[PDB]
Each structure stands twice: as C-alpha cells, then as structure tokens.
Structure 1
C-alpha cells in the first residue's frame, strides 16, 4: 500500500512509515538508501524492483 501510514517490513528491515514511489534513481547494486543523519529513507522493493 502506498501513500498511507502502514507498518512495513522489507527484507526483515521493519519499521513504520508512509511509503511513496520515489524519483531518486538507485544504482543497480544499491539496496537501502540513507539520509544525512544516517536514517533509512529509501528502500528498494524486493519482489518488484
């Protein structure tokens, strides 16, 4: 579910947030994004890339 406060567990990452489709373009190897303060902000969906 997108655009909704949903508790999410990605690859066993876990946490609660609002998941929205992102314009930032990951490099092929990268999997988990991070912020300036090193907080998980972007996650790459396993089943569908």
Structure 2
C-alpha cells in the first residue's frame, strides 16, 4: 500500500488497534505491517548478510 521495502515476511502475534496500518520500534524503522486484503499482522526481517 505504497510502503516499500525488502526483507523476509513472517507471521507475527502483535495486536494493532483497529485503525493502525503498520508499526515501528525505535529510530523509526518499520517492523510490522497489516496486509489490506486480509487484515492480519505480518512481520518484516532483513534478509541476512555478513
């Protein structure tokens, strides 16, 4: 929904209130989204490097 980025998407157990769309933790980095077509909380994790 216009919020772009890369990473791996997993299932998450967070609980947004009925009007948020996504989340962030500290330094304002997105780490959870709600898919519009299902209204369930996903989870974003950057894919590995080293």
TM-score between the two structures when normalised by the length of structure 2: 0.71
Q: Give the aligned partner of residue 8 of structure 1.
A: none
Q: Give the aligned partner of residue 24 of structure 2.
A: 34
Find out whether 1:22 has 2:16 as its counterpart.
no
- Structure 1: runs of 5 or more not aligned: 1-10
What is the aligned length?
A: 39
TM-score between the two structures when normalised by the length of structure 1: 0.72
Structure with more of its chain in strand, by fraction: 2
Runs of 4+ in 1 over 2 A off after TM superposition: none
